Amino acid sequence: PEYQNIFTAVQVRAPAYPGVPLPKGNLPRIGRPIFSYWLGKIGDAQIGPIYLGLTGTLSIFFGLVAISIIGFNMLASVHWDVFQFLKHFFWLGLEPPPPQYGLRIPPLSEGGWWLMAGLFLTLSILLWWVRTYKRAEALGMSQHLSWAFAAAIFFYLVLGFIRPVMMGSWAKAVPFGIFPHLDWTAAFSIRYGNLYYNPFHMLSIAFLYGSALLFAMHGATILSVSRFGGDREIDQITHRGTAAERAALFWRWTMGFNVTMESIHRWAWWCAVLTVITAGIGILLSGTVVDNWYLWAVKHGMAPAYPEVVTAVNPYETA
């Protein structure tokens, strides 16, 4: 346990905290809290209780159907031979409906199960979003999490709702497969002229990167200032403290400007939530609005120019 506020050297335990009182109508928490010395050596040790109401139960049950369907077909292709199942797991996956069905409901064989397990996974998330909304207002909390989770969901549906349907073919939808879905994103790009030139795709990376960047700063800074109680952000947001009182000066002296203990968390939010925002878009545009982002770039004089040390002929025009 090296102390750079990395691992809690000495842990202590108190009676299982059954969460704070909820409002009327909200079922009582369930689950006997557990304690883990190891886990707790990372952060908190106590576990649960967990809430589970209508939306919750309706969700945990819903999406649990999709997962089954998927894992089922997977173990199905392997001819129910677990041996080869745990072998080709990565490869195994529930493929979408063939283009010879458009959007029509295909038979369980040719793409059916996918669609089904899809809607069950589509609503499973939409429903889960409400589940979170019910956990916010029940605690007088705001909906910053729902707003974000929403954004993510946006891009999630772009991969099936808004784009595929806008294309008129369930073929342009990601498959239920660890590896095969990697090929999806692998093919999509190839199909649309290289996402490197797709504007939104870049903007989105700036976030996948920025995101990682900030937390690398914040998560760190808070620790570096964890000495002066820099982890207790809440009472810091209310009445500024010494932690946040030097915590900024650092950044200020280093990069010139800075933000407040609260402020930053707002940047982080928009630097992360905006990630998928530029995600669903960059994909909502591809296939529909644009078809070849390479020529699209050069069309606007984007694509860089390189000398010609290597070039190939074209047997088509020739022959």
Binding site: P1, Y3, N5, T8, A9, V10, Q11, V12, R13, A14, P15, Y17, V20, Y37, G40, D44, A45, Q46, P199, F200, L203, S226, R227, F228, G229, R232, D235, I237, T238, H239, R240, G241, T242, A243, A244, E245, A248, G256, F257, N258, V259, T260, M261, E262, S263, R266, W267, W270, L274, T278, I281, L285, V289, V290, W296, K299, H300, G301
Partner: protein, 258 residues
Amino acid sequence: SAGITHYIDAAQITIWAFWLFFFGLIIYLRREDKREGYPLDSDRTERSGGRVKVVGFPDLPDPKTFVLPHNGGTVVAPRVEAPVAVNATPFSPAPGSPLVPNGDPMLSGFGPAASPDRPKHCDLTFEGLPKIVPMRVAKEFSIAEGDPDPRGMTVVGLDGEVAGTVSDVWVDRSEPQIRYLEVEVAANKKKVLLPIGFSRFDKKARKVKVDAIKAAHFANVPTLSNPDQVTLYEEDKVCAYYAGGKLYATAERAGPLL
């Protein structure tokens, strides 16, 4: 992004739609980034930026209103805070130059040892009891089954010499954890609190190593008003004292290495 445009299409009709929202959001943020600190104090080096300006690109925002919980006051952001005090003299009449700590920098309360006057009250839990308290009050808290007990270990010091021995540790009701250590200085025989952040463990020799300040410095550590609860005011002024050591506990530290 080109100065002149000869091509028009939907893809690009949405891109700019973003940058506008972006150029706007970045401002929204900036505004918030000024709810603590500004306005500035001097003019050592005339605000630098592509476009100077009086106080940044975005005008200061409107004071937000924070309703603390029960039995609490109210906070506003931003707020007009009265000027602080500097117990240091300018190393040079030239702007920007640092300020040398007067007297013993270990307690000059400047820079590393310098801490703002936090509310001379105490943080509480959801119900209303002082959040951070000593185990001598936390009748429920016990050392994790297995993890070695701190209560009884001898708190060593920077120079190595022993400064005292732990008599108790302060746990946190709100967030189960150990935040402070009720250390019993040998010199003054007083009882000062020790922050986790500076508290290091050596379960082998039953000690709580500290590179912050020397064993002798543990003597005049910002005392606490009520030994049954730590005040936010003092709490922040506490662990700040140790910080000084991080840069004053030895002339060599502040001194260059090369």
